[PDB]
């Protein structure tokens, strides 16, 4: 296995919404957070 990405509250990059649904495919190198 597992990994966690941690962002500070002031980080302007926000987690991409589709990944809030469990079971969603995460392709390595694809964008998971963006400004």
């Amino acid at each position: 296995x597992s990994f966690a990405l941690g962002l500070r509250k002031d980080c302007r990059a926000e987690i991409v919404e589709k990944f809030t649904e469990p079971g969603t495919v995460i392709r390595i190198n694809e964008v998971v957070a963006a400004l």
Partner: protein, 348 residues
């Protein structure tokens, strides 16, 4: 007959403490199939650690025989003692030596072993491993020699940590490496959880069994910077690519390896059914947020080049026997999004 030395020492430890010994009796209550007692567990460990995994089970081999024990209060109690987890670390490190050896190539074959298990080069396993690669074949996606014995891999670990042959085709750095505003997935995975406004807890009891920053980050001095932040957590299943990639253009600030648990599930799940199929999740796979706080893990802080992103963290979280976290970057090194960052191994 005859057990490898680290297992003999593991067994001696169990028998060295009456409370630990009693946990290794109670956790087996009512169990009908092997392992039925901690002696059988040691015997089965001795076989597992001299073999490589095969394709077919929901999880790796030690998990499969430990799951019933983890799902008891006595097991959870034993498996949250740091003294016992020192032994698990030694055992899995020993297995890791075998899995890095040429002898472990004997599962990198196309054989079907029975109705539900096969070698990793059997078509059933190959297809499972390329499910998310849009029709490309294993030998197109991954660096290997499909015409060589064992596909050219030198060990089970080499196969486990196979590399992409052409990531610009199969796993591109979406948006372009030079766009410093983007954060990429560090691992090939399935989303498990996203939490916002994350905080620290004094104890990991009740309270939704959520993240506790000070636990997760092992009381790092950076921890306060992440209070009220957000966390994305992914799960790498048994067939996933298991290397780590850099999530942002930035500088490695700090790498911390934290000893921890291997077989601790969330206490609220103790006693839940363990489904007899590969699609209904068992309790341990409903515990990833809980044990992110306590599992053997590596914490990596990265300062993004873009200071609107600034300091971020990754935690690489062990699960049962797949708990070695190897960083291949050094503190102070600059990385670009997509670069090789490290990998998981079988081990403690």
């Amino acid at each position: 007959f005859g057990l490898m030395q680290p297992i003999q020492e593991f067994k001696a430890f169990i028998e060295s403490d009456p409370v630990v010994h009693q946990e290794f009796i109670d956790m087996f209550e009512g169990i009908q199939d092997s392992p039925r007692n901690y002696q059988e567990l040691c015997n089965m460990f001795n076989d597992i650690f001299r073999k490589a995994p095969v394709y077919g089970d929901l999880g790796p081999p030690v998990y499969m025989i430990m799951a019933k024990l983890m799902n008891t209060r006595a097991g959870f109690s034993a498996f949250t003692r740091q003294r016992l987890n020192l032994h698990f670390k030694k055992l899995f490190d020993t297995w890791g030596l075998f899995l890095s050896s040429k002898d472990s190539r004997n599962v990198l074959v196309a054989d079907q072993f029975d109705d539900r298990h096969c070698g990793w080069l059997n078509e059933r396993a190959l297809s499972a491993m390329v499910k998310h690669y849009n029709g490309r074949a294993f030998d197109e996606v991954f660096l290997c020699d499909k015409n060589a014995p064992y596909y050219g891999f030198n060990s089970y670990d080499d196969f486990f940590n196979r590399r992409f042959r052409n990531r610009d085709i199969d796993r591109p750095v979406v948006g372009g490496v030079n766009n410093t505003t983007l954060i990429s997935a560090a691992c090939e995975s399935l989303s498990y959880n996203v939490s916002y406004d994350v905080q620290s807890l004094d104890t990991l009891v009740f309270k939704g069994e959520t993240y506790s920053l000070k636990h997760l980050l092992n009381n790092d001095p950076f921890t306060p910077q992440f209070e009220h932040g957000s966390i994305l957590q992914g799960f790498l299943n048994v067939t996933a690519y298991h290397r780590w990639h850099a999530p942002v253009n930035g500088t490695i600030v700090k790498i911390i390896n934290v000893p921890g648990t291997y077989f601790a599930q969330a206490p609220s799940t103790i006693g839940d059914p363990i489904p007899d199929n590969d699609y209904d999740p068992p309790p341990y796979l409903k515990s990833l947020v809980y044990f992110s706080n306590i599992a053997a893990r590596q914490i990596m802080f990265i300062e993004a080049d873009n200071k609107e992103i600034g300091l971020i963290f990754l935690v690489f979280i062990g699960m049962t026997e797949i708990s070695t976290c190897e960083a291949t970057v050094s503190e102070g090194q600059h990385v670009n999004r997509g670069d090789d960052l490290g990998m998981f191994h079988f081990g403690g």
